[PDB]
Design an enzyme around this catalytic site. Structure first.
Site, PDB file in Angstrom:
ATOM      1  N   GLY C   9       0.672  -1.425   0.088  1.00 51.18           N
ATOM      2  CA  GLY C   9      -0.196  -0.013   0.000  1.00 51.18           C
ATOM      3  C   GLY C   9       0.814   1.355  -0.119  1.00 51.18           C
ATOM      4  N   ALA C  11       1.102   3.965   2.025  1.00 52.15           N
ATOM      5  CA  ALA C  11       1.629   4.363   3.448  1.00 52.15           C
ATOM      6  C   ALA C  11       3.111   3.229   3.695  1.00 52.15           C
ATOM      7  CB  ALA C  11       0.769   4.130   4.529  1.00 52.15           C
ATOM      8  N   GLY C 142      -5.826   1.911   4.501  1.00 54.20           N
ATOM      9  CA  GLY C 142      -5.779   1.738   2.956  1.00 54.20           C
ATOM     10  C   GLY C 142      -6.200   0.341   2.479  1.00 54.20           C
ATOM     11  N   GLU C 182     -12.350   3.767   7.300  1.00 53.40           N
ATOM     12  CA  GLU C 182     -10.983   3.411   7.711  1.00 53.40           C
ATOM     13  C   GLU C 182     -11.091   2.434   8.987  1.00 53.40           C
ATOM     14  OE1 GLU C 182      -8.291   7.452   6.317  1.00 53.40           O
ATOM     15  OE2 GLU C 182      -8.721   6.936   8.416  1.00 53.40           O
ATOM     16  N   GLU C 253      13.500 -13.089  18.995  1.00 50.58           N
ATOM     17  CA  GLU C 253      14.124 -12.440  20.097  1.00 50.58           C
ATOM     18  C   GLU C 253      12.967 -11.437  20.575  1.00 50.58           C
ATOM     19  OE1 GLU C 253      17.814 -10.943  20.053  1.00 50.58           O
ATOM     20  OE2 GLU C 253      17.798 -10.100  22.157  1.00 50.58           O
TER      21      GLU C 253
HETATM   22  N1  LIG Z   1       2.342   8.070   8.120  1.00 53.23           N
HETATM   23  C1  LIG Z   1       1.731   7.984   6.963  1.00 53.23           C
HETATM   24  N2  LIG Z   1       0.578   7.437   6.897  1.00 53.23           N
HETATM   25  C2  LIG Z   1      -0.440   7.662   5.669  1.00 53.23           C
HETATM   26  C3  LIG Z   1       0.445   7.993   4.495  1.00 53.23           C
HETATM   27  N3  LIG Z   1      -0.188   7.985   3.434  1.00 53.23           N
HETATM   28  C4  LIG Z   1      -1.589   7.455   3.968  1.00 53.23           C
HETATM   29  N4  LIG Z   1      -1.354   7.215   5.379  1.00 53.23           N
HETATM   30  C5  LIG Z   1      -2.395   6.686   6.054  1.00 53.23           C
HETATM   31  O1  LIG Z   1      -2.873   5.131   5.517  1.00 53.23           O
HETATM   32  C6  LIG Z   1      -4.234   5.322   5.430  1.00 53.23           C
HETATM   33  C7  LIG Z   1      -4.644   5.002   3.896  1.00 53.23           C
HETATM   34  O2  LIG Z   1      -3.745   4.119   3.473  1.00 53.23           O
HETATM   35  P1  LIG Z   1      -3.034   3.683   2.223  1.00 53.23           P
HETATM   36  O3  LIG Z   1      -1.565   3.181   2.154  1.00 53.23           O
HETATM   37  O4  LIG Z   1      -2.607   5.364   1.796  1.00 53.23           O
HETATM   38  O5  LIG Z   1      -4.075   3.228   0.888  1.00 53.23           O
HETATM   39  P2  LIG Z   1      -3.476   2.174   0.064  1.00 53.23           P
HETATM   40  O6  LIG Z   1      -2.947   0.966   0.956  1.00 53.23           O
HETATM   41  O7  LIG Z   1      -2.435   2.570  -1.074  1.00 53.23           O
HETATM   42  O8  LIG Z   1      -5.021   1.670  -0.663  1.00 53.23           O
HETATM   43  P3  LIG Z   1      -5.381   2.169  -1.872  1.00 53.23           P
HETATM   44  O9  LIG Z   1      -5.214   3.586  -1.871  1.00 53.23           O
HETATM   45  O10 LIG Z   1      -6.631   1.739  -2.254  1.00 53.23           O
HETATM   46  O11 LIG Z   1      -4.403   1.638  -2.937  1.00 53.23           O
HETATM   47  C8  LIG Z   1      -4.723   6.528   5.871  1.00 53.23           C
HETATM   48  O12 LIG Z   1      -5.505   6.386   7.244  1.00 53.23           O
HETATM   49  C9  LIG Z   1      -3.658   7.443   6.385  1.00 53.23           C
HETATM   50  O13 LIG Z   1      -3.984   8.100   7.554  1.00 53.23           O
HETATM   51  C10 LIG Z   1       1.715   8.697   4.621  1.00 53.23           C
HETATM   52  O14 LIG Z   1       2.440   8.827   3.482  1.00 53.23           O
HETATM   53  N5  LIG Z   1       2.429   8.501   6.020  1.00 53.23           N
END
Ligand SMILES: Nc1nc2c(ncn2[C@@H]2O[C@H](COP(=O)(O)OP(=O)(O)OP(=O)(O)O)[C@@H](O)[C@H]2O)c(=O)[nH]1
Ligand SMILES: Nc1nc2c(ncn2[C@@H]2O[C@H](COP(=O)(O)OP(=O)(O)O)[C@@H](O)[C@H]2O)c(=O)[nH]1
Ligand SMILES: [Mg+2]
Ligand SMILES: [Mg+2]
EC number: 3.6.5.-
Lengths: 431, 47, 436
Positions: C9, C11, C142, C182, C253
């Site tokens: 994903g 993030a 996500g 979410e 560990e």
């Molecule tokens: N720390 C951090 N959290 C993030 C970031 N981008 C998204 N998030 C968190 O991740 C969640 C969304 O997940 P994503 O990873 O962006 O979505 P995805 O896994 O790509 O899934 P799709 O968008 O459907 O492809 C939200 O609750 C955000 O708060 C980031 O760049 N940094």
């Protein structure tokens, strides 16, 4: 997720579609010939969403213009931007419609729909990853409503892994081209409930209000309303047309704004309420924006949200402004009227910001709302309709075109049911 | 495991029932002798 | 011995970018893969080769493969200032994204690419002369991160039985939140991952927000900001595996030091000192001060009060310029001063380790090239606050089963919710029983 294939059907649908393409074509920086001349890269970061990429540094609207009138396409071509449309994407018949749904959906319309589908498939084969389909039409006419609902059915059945999106406009007793607008509207809603994922409800009566009262235009011409429609549509598609995590594509936005399968009927809201070619002697602030765009006077549907509780809200602020001021003001509007919001959907009011503001306006506020107040629209129709359906008046103009009397009662019943659904979810609590 | 929905379920189940009380006529408004512009009038007489 | 990391994903992938950047800055590896010291174009035996496999050209390729049902992010990987590091086969890019839908990531779009994903894990799991296990990055909200991660964990306790698998998750902050559902994904991707996971740390984005706004003075933290913080937080929990360290040198560990029971494997982590690159800059902090900051909720990664809560296990990883007896003194002072209540059936003694190297940071980054640093890994019962801020953001919606029809529409039964709720209630219950 990428391309959106756009369609416009009927007299109203083709007019307002033309104006919408004028708007976003001017925002992104496209000329009536098709060349790009803008002075910002952010305009072309997500330009493929609504534009085929053609050789010669041109840009062609990935659109498809449908009617059964001849003259509407004539008003398109000799119109300003009528040169840019790929001529093979013009598809229109010669019979007409007569503001008759049954004609549009079963007879004269059905003898053109396969030819529409072949152009749709020609645009969808040159696609890479197709998102869905955006549709605009009238619900009170014959072409856009009937043939439109037909197209929605056959397209959502040809690709059911994509999104189906409609901008429908209402019958208005204050405008009123005919007196079977309730029938057309009723059936078209009956289709739209099971067919589409999103429906942005423009109310023609509401627009007559905003023109005659707020804008004080005493004899509202059709273009006058089409300006408000064009602004609304430009605003709600900002999330899709510019870089934004929030509501990046149709599927995301739909999943955030639609908690129940049937209930996907959105009250849009624009601020400030602008006439055509008018000066901004004192452009609004941020508190003034947020205050107006939730006020009932700025609503595109002829409904009061002081009567209905929002299920979700997608607010969009256009023009550079203080983001902290935005977040604060939004919190204000939310928890000052928290007895007008559902609490069983936490953080349901999402907000995205854009930088290139609308044409001429320094700042604007575009609002999408999944409200249980929208039933005040249906209950109008479902009354307008019933009054005539009781003694079966004007039925021969549809049954004579080959329909079934039960197809109407399925519609009236399905609509009264959608209203009972809306009230049901309105009386929801935290137990 | 809530209420409110329940009053909506009671709806959703009935709408399907209505659908079958329409999808009954259709494939049962077919069968053997089941035509000619007087089909409604004939079904009237037969009933 | 050698471990393999995996990113799911948006993030997860971005986090991976930053983390491997930091790894290279600490070891002294150039962006094209070279190293001054090194070991003659491929030695495969150093401490830092538990994560890097070297090539005939001396290219220290990271043992990692990147995954997204959405190419937009991983393309920012193969386009960034490190386009020459990896191999394109370590980059898997789908078409349609999961659209923040768990059912789209586990069932629909997941099954249409899992085979290629295993296919790409394999080639780098063969070069493992001895595989310890896996490290996985993802999000809770996500779609890709919630669904395809659970699919890969299910199909990872299969193809690799049980060696070790350790998790890193991102808890939803209604701040930078983008989706209404979410909570849903967040619950499911836990109910369908509780068992396949050996250990799992969490990250409340609201805490990273509170910390960049409190201790870094960034009124509006962008994603690159929060991420730039979470990287330097992670690279201290994992710095023990890449160098010749004392504590936390095997993947299991962690299960030993931190986990008394596998169901409860969510350690509160706390990092100090968090100080900007232009802030204060007065006298550097002592060891006792950074040790004391390990027990301030302003520095904890999950918004929870360990005060009103029991501890179970508690480690402290130090790096920089530290003295042993100093740490011992601070340990005693905290042991006596506080009401840090430990449950009875656990070793209340605090195991500690050091790495005598300066904690390098991002040059020109939002943080300070500090001198000495400490990271507490304390599993505490108070972390059960976190789930309570999801189940409450859950029961409000399953009590109107809104947004449920989208999961049903993408291949998942309504009973998976009815079981995924009771499961979480059970885990919370365990978190209660540890105390009394
Ligand atoms: N720390 C951090 N959290 C993030 C970031 N981008 C998204 N998030 C968190 O991740 C969640 C969304 O997940 P994503 O990873 O962006 O979505 P995805 O896994 O790509 O899934 P799709 O968008 O459907 O492809 C939200 O609750 C955000 O708060 C980031 O760049 N940094
Ligand atoms: N906003 C707007 N509404 C229109 C316009 N023309 C017609 N309508 C409305 O749409 C309905 C007529 O539909 P129309 O498109 O003209 O019929 P069609 O050609 O068969 O699709 C009536 O209820 C009108 O109130 C227009 O130019 N602008
Ligand atoms: Mg017409
Ligand atoms: Mg994504």
């Amino acid at each position: 997720m990428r391309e959106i294939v756009h369609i416009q059907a009927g007299q109203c649908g083709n007019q307002i579609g033309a104006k919408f393409w004028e708007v976003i074509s001017d925002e992104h920086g496209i000329d009536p010939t098709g060349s790009y001349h803008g002075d910002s890269d952010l305009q072309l970061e997500r330009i493929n969403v609504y534009y085929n990429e053609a050789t010669g540094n041109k840009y062609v609207p990935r659109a498809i213009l449908v009617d059964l009138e001849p003259g509407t396409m004539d008003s398109v071509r000799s119109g300003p931007f009528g040169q840019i449309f790929r001529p093979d994407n013009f598809v229109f018949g010669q019979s007409g419609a007569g503001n008759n749904w049954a004609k549009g959906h079963y007879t004269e319309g059905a003898e053109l729909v396969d030819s529409v589908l072949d152009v749709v498939r020609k645009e969808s084969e040159s696609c890479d990853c197709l998102q869905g389909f955006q549709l605009t039409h009238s619900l009170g006419g014959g072409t856009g409503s009937g043939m439109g609902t037909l197209l929605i059915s056959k397209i959502r059945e040809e690709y059911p892994d994509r999104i189906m999106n409609t901008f429908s406009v209402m019958p208005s007793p204050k405008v009123s081209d005919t007196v079977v607008e309730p029938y057309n509207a009723t059936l078209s809603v009956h289709q739209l409930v099971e067919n589409t994922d999103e429906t942005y409800c423009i109310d023609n009566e509401a627009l007559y209000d905003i023109c005659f009262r707020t804008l004080k235009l005493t004899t509202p011409t059709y273009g006058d309303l089409n300006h408000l429609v064009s602004a609304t549509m430009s605003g709600v598609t900002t999330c899709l047309r510019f870089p934004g995590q929030l509501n990046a594509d149709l599927r995301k936005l739909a999943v955030n704004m639609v908690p129940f399968p049937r209930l996907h009927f959105f009250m849009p809201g624009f601020a400030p309420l602008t006439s055509r070619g008018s000066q901004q002697y004192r452009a609004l602030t941020v508190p003034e924006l947020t205050q107006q765009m939730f006020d009932s006077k700025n609503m595109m549907a002829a409904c009061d949200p002081r009567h209905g509780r929002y299920l979700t809200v997608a607010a969009i602020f256009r023009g550079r402004m203080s983001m902290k001021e935005v977040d604060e003001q939004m919190l204000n509007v939310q928890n000052k009227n928290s007895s007008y919001f559902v609490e069983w959907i936490p953080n349901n009011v999402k907000t995205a910001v854009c930088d290139i503001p609308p044409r001429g306006l320094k700042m604007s506020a575009t609002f999408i709302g999944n409200s249980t107040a929208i039933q005040e629209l249906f209950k109008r129709i479902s009354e307008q309709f019933t009054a005539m359906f009781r003694r079966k008046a004007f039925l021969h103009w549809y049954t004579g075109e080959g329909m079934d009397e039960m197809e109407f009662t399925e519609a009236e019943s399905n609509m009264n049911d959608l209203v009972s659904e809306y009230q049901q979810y309105q009386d929801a609590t935290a137990d | 495991s809530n209420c409110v929905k329940e009053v909506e379920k009671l709806q959703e189940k009935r709408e399907k029932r209505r659908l079958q009380q329409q999808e009954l006529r259709e494939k049962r408004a077919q069968d053997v002798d089941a035509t000619n512009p007087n089909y409604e009038i004939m079904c009237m007489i037969r009933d | 011995r050698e471990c393999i990391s995996i990113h799911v994903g948006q993030a997860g992938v971005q986090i991976g970018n930053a983390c491997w950047e930091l790894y290279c800055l600490e070891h002294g590896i150039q962006p094209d893969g070279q190293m001054p010291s090194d070991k003659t174009i491929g030695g495969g035996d150093d401490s830092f080769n538990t994560f890097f496999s070297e090539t005939g050209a001396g290219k220290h390729v990271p043992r990692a493969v990147f995954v997204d049902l959405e190419p937009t992010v991983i393309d920012e990987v193969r386009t960034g200032t490190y386009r020459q590091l990896f191999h394109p086969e370590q980059l898997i890019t789908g078409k349609e994204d999961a659209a923040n839908n768990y059912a789209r990531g586990h069932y629909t779009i997941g099954k249409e690419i899992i085979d290629l994903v295993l296919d790409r894990i394999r080639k780098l799991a063969d070069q493992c002369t001895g595989l310890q296990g896996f490290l996985v990055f993802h999000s809770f909200g996500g779609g890709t991160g919630s669904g395809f991660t659970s699919l890969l964990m299910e199909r990872l306790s299969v193809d690799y039985g049980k060696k070790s698998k350790l998790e890193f998750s991102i808890y939803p902050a209604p701040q930078v939140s983008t989706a209404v559902v979410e909570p849903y994904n967040s619950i499911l991707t836990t109910h369908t991952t509780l068992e396949h996971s050996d250990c799992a740390f969490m990250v409340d984005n609201e805490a990273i927000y509170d910390i960049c706004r409190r201790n870094l003075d960034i009124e509006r933290p962008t994603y690159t900001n929060l991420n730039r913080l979470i990287s330097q937080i992670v690279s201290s929990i994992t710095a023990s595996l890449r160098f010749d360290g004392a504590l936390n040198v095997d993947l299991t560990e962690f299960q030993t030091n931190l986990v008394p029971y596998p169901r409860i494997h969510f350690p509160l982590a706390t990092y100090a000192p968090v100080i900007s690159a232009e802030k204060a800059y007065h006298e550097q902090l002592s060891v006792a001060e950074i040790t004391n900051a390990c027990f301030e909720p302003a520095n904890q990664m999950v918004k929870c009060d360990p005060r009103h809560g029991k501890y179970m296990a508690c480690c402290l990883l130090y790096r920089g310029d530290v003295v042993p007896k100093d740490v011992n003194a601070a340990i005693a002072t905290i042991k006596t001063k506080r009401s840090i209540q430990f449950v009875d059936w656990c070793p209340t003694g605090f195991k500690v380790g050091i790495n005598y190297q300066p904690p390098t940071v991002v040059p020109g980054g939002d943080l300070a090239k500090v001198q000495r640093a400490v990271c507490m890994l304390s599993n505490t019962t108070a972390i059960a606050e976190a789930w309570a801020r999801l189940d409450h953001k859950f029961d409000l919606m399953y009590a109107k089963r809104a947004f449920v029809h989208w999961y049903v529409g993408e291949g998942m039964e309504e009973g998976e919710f009815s079981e995924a709720r009771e499961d979480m209630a059970a885990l919370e219950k365990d978190y209660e029983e540890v105390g009394v």
